[PDB]
Amino acid sequence: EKQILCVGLVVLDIINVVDKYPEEDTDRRCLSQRWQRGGNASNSCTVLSLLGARCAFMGSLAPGHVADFLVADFRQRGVDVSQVTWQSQGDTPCSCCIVNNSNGSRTIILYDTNLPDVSAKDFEKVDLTRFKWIHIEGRNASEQVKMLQRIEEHNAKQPLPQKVRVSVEIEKPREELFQLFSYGEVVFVSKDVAKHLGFQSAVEALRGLYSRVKKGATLVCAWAEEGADALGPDGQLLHSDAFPPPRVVDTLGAGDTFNASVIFSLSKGNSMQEALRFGCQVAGKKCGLQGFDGIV
Amino acid sequence: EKQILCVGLVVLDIINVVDKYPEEDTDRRCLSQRWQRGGNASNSCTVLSLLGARCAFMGSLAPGHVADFLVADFRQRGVDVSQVTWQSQGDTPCSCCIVNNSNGSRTIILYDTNLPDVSAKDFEKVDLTRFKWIHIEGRNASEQVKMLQRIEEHNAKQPLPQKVRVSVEIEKPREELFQLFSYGEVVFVSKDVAKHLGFQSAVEALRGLYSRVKKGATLVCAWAEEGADALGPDGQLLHSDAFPPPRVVDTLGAGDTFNASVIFSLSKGNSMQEALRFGCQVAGKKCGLQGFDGIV
Ligand SMILES: CS(=O)(=O)c1cccc2[nH]c3c(c12)CCCc1ccc(CN2CC[C@](O)(c4ccccc4)C2)cc1-3
Ligand SMILES: CS(=O)(=O)c1cccc2[nH]c3c(c12)CCCc1ccc(CN2CC[C@](O)(c4ccccc4)C2)cc1-3
Predict the structure, then answer these.
(1) Going from the N-terminus, what domains does chain A have, and what CATH number goes with each?
(2) Is B65 touching A (CB cutoff 8 A)?
C-alpha cells in the first residue's frame, strides 16, 4: 500500500471571511476567522487524504507553537510527516488571507522568505520504493531539478509497475521555475503563469508551452470558471467544463483541490479525460464550501 | 508611586507590511510580517511605558499560546498585568492588518466577538488608591458607566491630590458609546466618530459635542494630518498642527500614541496646549516608524 509524496510548502493560513472586500485604510469585523494549514503541496495532501489516498508531506518547519499546530493538523488528517525537514533556524511561513463570502475571492499576503527549503541532499534520504507517486510543488527549482534527476535514475532501474510516477506544478510566475517544465509525466501550469506569459486561454497556453515538457509528458492547465484543459504526447487537446457551485463562497485552495484530484484519479489508473472531469467536479464542489472538509 | 490604569482591549495584531495595497483576488509576498500586541487600551500602555510612566492594563484574555505571548510582551515592556480578567471560555481577539509602507495606511480585519468583557463586578476589585489616572477604552458602555460611577463615588470622599484623574475614549461610531461622553475630565473623540455624526472638522466636532461632556471636562479630537484640537471649560479652542514624518510608513496605533502621550503629559502637570503639541509630536514620529519602539 504505497504512498503519494507531495514536496513543497506548509504555511499557517490565518483566514478572515468578509462580506465585502476592504477599502484601503478602513476597519472592519470579519464574519469569521480560522487558523488553517495551508501551502500548495500541504493542501494537495489534505485533499488526497479526504479522497482516501495514503499520502506523505515533505517540507520545512521551524520548531514553535505554529509548527506543533500544523503537525497536529497533518496527523489528524492521516498525512505522514516523517519526511518533514526540521530547521533549527528560521520562521514557519504564515499568510493572512481575505476570503470574500460574496464572490468566493481570496486575497493572500504571504511571509515565506525566512525558512531554508528542502535540499537535494535532504531528498537523497527518501526511500523511493514506499511511493507510487511523487508530486513536486515548484519552488527552489535548481535543488528540485536534482530531486527530479534522482527519481529518473531510480525509475530507469525499475520494471514498469515499480516506476514512481512524477508530477510537477508551476503555479507562480517566477522565471527560475520554467526549468521544471522539462520534468515529470504530468506538469500543472496555473492560469496565473499562463496569463503572465501572454496566454489568454488554456488551449493557447498548452500549445505555447508543450515544447517545454518531457517527451511523453502531459501538460495540464486549469482556467478557473472556464474549466480545465490538457495536452499529451498524442497531440490531442482534452477539456472539461468547470462545475461551479450554486454559490461560490471560498476559492482558497481550489487549485490544489484540482491538482490532488487529478493525481488521485491518474494514480487509480483513470484516463486524462476522466482525471480532468474529476478534478473540475471536486474543486468545483470545494468552491461552494469554507475549507476542504465538505468535499466528501 | 501611583500607576496609570488603561481599561479596554488587548488584541493579537498580525501585521503584513506591503509596498502597495493588494487588489482583490491577487497573491503577494509581504515586505515583512510581525505579530504585535494590539488593541487600543493595550497600545496606550505600550506608549505610556516607553515614555517612562508606570502603567497597568485591565482587559480580558483567554488561556492559550496567544495570551502567553501577549502577557510576555506586556511584562517585557514593564506593563503591570495583575488586573487582567482571565476568561475560562472564549477566544483572545486577533486582527489581520495590512500596513502599506508607500503611504502608511492600515487596513484592519478584526475578530473580537468571542470574549467576555471586563465587568463592573471585575472593576469593583480595583484598588482606586493605587492609581492616579484611569483611562477607559469605550466598549461595553453600560458596564463601563458603572465603573465610572464607582470612581466618582471614590473621588467625592477624597481630597484634591487623592482624586483619580479619568479619561475616556470614543473611537468607534457605535450608538452605545455616546453615553460615555458624560464621564471623565478628558474625553477623546476620533475623527471617525465625528465624521459619522456629520462633523467635517475637529473645531466643528468640539463645538457640536461639548454640551455632552461633564462640567469642567476637556473634549479632545485628533484629525490626522490636520493635527489635533481641544476645548475645555474656559470655552477656548486649542490646536496643534500635525508633525508628519519625512515618510509616512505606519499609521497603525497612531491614535493610541496620541491618546497615551496626552494622558502622560497631563498626568505630569502640563497644560492642555502643551499636551496637544506633545501628542502630535509623539504620534507624528510614531507614523515614520514600524511599530512603537522608535519613539524614544
Ligand atoms: C479546477 S477548477 O474547478 O476549474 C478551479 C481551479 C482553481 C481555481 C478555480 N476558481 C474557480 C474554479 C477553479 C472553477 C469553478 C468555481 C469558480 C467560480 C467562480 C470563479 C470566479 N470568481 C471567484 C473570485 C473571482 O475570481 C474574483 C476576482 C476578482 C475580484 C472578485 C472576484 C471571480 C472562479 C471559480
Ligand atoms: C495625533 S496625530 O499624529 O495627529 C494622528 C492621530 C491619529 C491618526 C493619524 N493619522 C495621521 C496622523 C494621525 C498625523 C501625522 C501622520 C499622518 C500622515 C498622513 C495621513 C494621511 N494618509 C495616511 C494613509 C491615508 O489615510 C490613506 C487613506 C486611503 C488610502 C491611502 C492612504 C492618507 C495621516 C496621518
Answers:
(1) 3-295 (3.40.1190.20)
(2) yes
